[PDB]
Amino acid sequence: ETFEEFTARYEKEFDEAYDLFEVQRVLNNCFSYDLVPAPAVIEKALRAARRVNDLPTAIRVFEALKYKVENEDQYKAYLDELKDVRQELGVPLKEELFP
Amino acid sequence: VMDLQSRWENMPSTEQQDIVSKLSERQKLPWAQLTEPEKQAVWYISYGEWGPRRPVLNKGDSSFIAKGVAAGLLFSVGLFAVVRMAGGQDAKTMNK
Amino acid sequence: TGLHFGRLSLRSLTAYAPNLMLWGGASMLGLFVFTEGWPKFQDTLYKKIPL
Amino acid sequence: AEVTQLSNGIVVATEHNPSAHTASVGVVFGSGAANENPYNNGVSNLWKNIFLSKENSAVAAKEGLALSSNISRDFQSYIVSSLPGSTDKSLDFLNQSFIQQKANLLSSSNFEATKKSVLKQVQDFEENDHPNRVLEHLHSTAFQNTPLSLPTRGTLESLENLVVADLESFANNHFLNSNAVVVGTGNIKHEDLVNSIESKNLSLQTGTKPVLKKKAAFLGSEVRLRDDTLPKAWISLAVEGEPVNSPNYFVAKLAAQIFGSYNAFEPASRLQGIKLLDNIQEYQLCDNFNHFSLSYKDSGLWGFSTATRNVTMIDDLIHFTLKQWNRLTISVTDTEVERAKSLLKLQLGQLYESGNPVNDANLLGAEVLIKGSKLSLGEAFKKIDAITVKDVKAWAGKRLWDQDIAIAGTGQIEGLLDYMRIRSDMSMMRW
């Protein structure tokens, strides 16, 4: 219900990924609540994206937080911490990609 | 070997390919040696716009909607004008 | 194996003549346009329902 | 003569000519240039030239076997000619060339040398062969954004992107069982070819070539490749023709035959029985023209290509040619129809019954791929004899009288006017 028990409970439910649509469904519903996601939740999200053998959902989580990030300042802060996380990940921005 | 070959590098240009499923089978997993002109391909193929995520109104259609509304309204008002305007009150002077 | 010609062929004349009757008809329709308002032709020109 | 046909998944169709001295045996695939997306374009040309590569032709020439190939819009072919005692050798060579292996043909050095050679040939075609590149742009603009627009030769910008993976992907999607017809023409018997195929295995693949999403549709347009540094003005101009398996196939060809072909420098070509020549020979409007009735699987083209040096009177050339085309709808005579019957019997019997077995193999392979069996020439002559003047007038009213045209031109085509006067000249305003 609060911030921290949310983070703990759905990271525990989130390391039960094992699959494509399972990790994508738990990403959907754990993203669609009434709180911004914790950075630890998105680190487990990128690690589960490495586990489930799929790259474009690791792009999709970033445009999802680009919508939900509610300002530009938290967006640049997430760009910083998620930037050196990308350097240890290998995932591109859409703005770096131009489809 | 093991990487794609610019067979069709503009994936948002066509999904007119018959067997797209071979191109989806083609995909791999070494993670960031993916040759970004076909790392566009996995995002577009898995997340593009056809079937699901097709907009309700296409770009051409919205102008057709407003045009058809105005044309139907004009045909209604013109039909009202050319059905009947005849035999009313006595005269404007009588109202005066 | 000859033909009746005067630089115009008899085959060509019978090929164009079912169109030339329609040309005469369209020219008569043209006269019927440009000759109303002339009261001498209106003894003939209003019969069915232009009156 | 007689054409037989049998099946086991492959299709074996022959023409036993016992009077000939050679025997062509080869496979004719049902894919062509019209089965490529515009990014792997020219992969059929590159398969043609790795099959005709130097190592492969040397191994062929050790046994006395000459190779041949052909890339069309609809059909590819890979024909191996030999003496009539070496049909088993030709079949075993074709087996070893395609079926048994492809990696030795697709080595690195052979592929790079062949890609260099085809890039040279496509550039040489692009900047030196003018009437054929006019006809290729005529196909590229009559059928645009549609797979029948792609040139058989390929483009320089696409062909320098092909690697071996695209060659193998096209091979896996198009060199298949049901897609192919193995053809033997010349001095071989049908039973010998069938027993020799069943003696081997010769199974190409599982089958099912990909189906094109978009069908061919004609689109009236123009393209103008104006190059003022050329001595002539080449120009093709065509309407939507008749595809194969149409009832108006021979009528479209006879309509092309009525106005024939012409060469202004040959003396016997200036005396033909065409009424266009009386208008065209006075001020020397063109050097040559030919009327073509091209027929593909989905659509077709009917029109004429020409070349001229009288670059200030191109519009008069187009004008008199199109008024002669308008004579088909209104007032084509009986003698012109009889003359076109005799000339089309002549050129059709020269085409189907020439002495060269590889051309017979290409034609028979194309025809039994498209329509399942080869129409022999006697029934073709009966169908030509059945055409009357009313059939030609009905066809011209359906396809010629006030229909959209497609124009392609290069050279000094400034004398060629706008699209609209050429379009409006398709109907006479006097009929």
- Helix share of residues of chain D? 40-55%
Secondary-structure element order of chain D, as H and E?
A: EEEHHEEHHHHHEHEEHEHEEHHHHHEH
- The H-and-E topology of chain B, N to C, reads as HHHH
Largest interface: B-D, 13 and 14 residues
Strand content of chain D: 15-25%
The neighbouring-strand order within the major sheet of chain D is 1-2-6-3-5-4
Oligomer: part of a larger assembly
Radius of gyration of chain D, Cα only, in angstroms?
23 Å
Class of the largest domain in chain D, according to the CATH hierarchy? Answer: Alpha Beta
Q: Which radius of gyration of chain B do the C-alpha atoms yield?
A: 30 Å
**Biggest sheet of chain B: strands, sense, closure?**
none
The CATH architecture designation of the largest domain in chain D is 2-Layer Sandwich
Number of helices of chain D: 16
| Shape assignment of chain D | globular
Q: Which class do the helix and strand fractions of chain D yield?
A: alpha+beta
Outline the biggest β-sheet of chain D: 6 strands, mixed
Question: CATH superfamily membership of the largest domain in chain D, which one?
Answer: Metalloenzyme, LuxS/M16 peptidase-like
The CATH topology annotation of the largest domain in chain D reads as Cytochrome Bc1 Complex, Chain A, domain 1
Number of strands of chain B: 0
PDB class: electron transport
Keywords: Respiratory chain, supercomplex, bc1 complex, cytochrome c oxidase, electron transport
Entry title: Saccharomyces cerevisiae respiratory supercomplex III2IV
Chain A: BJ4_G0024040.mRNA.1.CDS.1
Name the features:
part of a larger assembly, 4 chains, B: 96 residues, mainly alpha, 4 helices, 42% helix, D: 431 residues, Cytochrome Bc1 Complex, Chain A, domain 1, six-stranded mixed sheet, globular, electron transport, Respiratory chain, supercomplex, bc1 complex, cytochrome c oxidase
What does this structure look like?
The structure is cut from a larger assembly and holds chains A (99 residues), B (96 residues), C (51 residues) and D (431 residues). Chain A is mainly α and 99 residues long. Chain A is built from 5 helices and no strands. Chain A has a single domain (1-99), classed as Cytochrome c oxidase, subunit Va/VI (Serine Threonine Protein Phosphatase 5, Tetratricopeptide repeat). Helices cover 63% and strands 0% of the residues of chain A. The N and C termini of chain A lie far apart (39 Å). Chain B has helices spanning 21-25, 40-47, 59-81, 92-95. The termini of chain B are far apart. Chain C is 57% helix and 0% strand. The radius of gyration of chain C is 18 Å and the shape is rod-shaped. The N and C termini of chain C lie far apart (58 Å). With 431 residues, chain D is an alpha+beta fold. Chains in contact: A-B, B-D, C-D. The interface between B and D is medium-sized, with 13 and 14 residues.
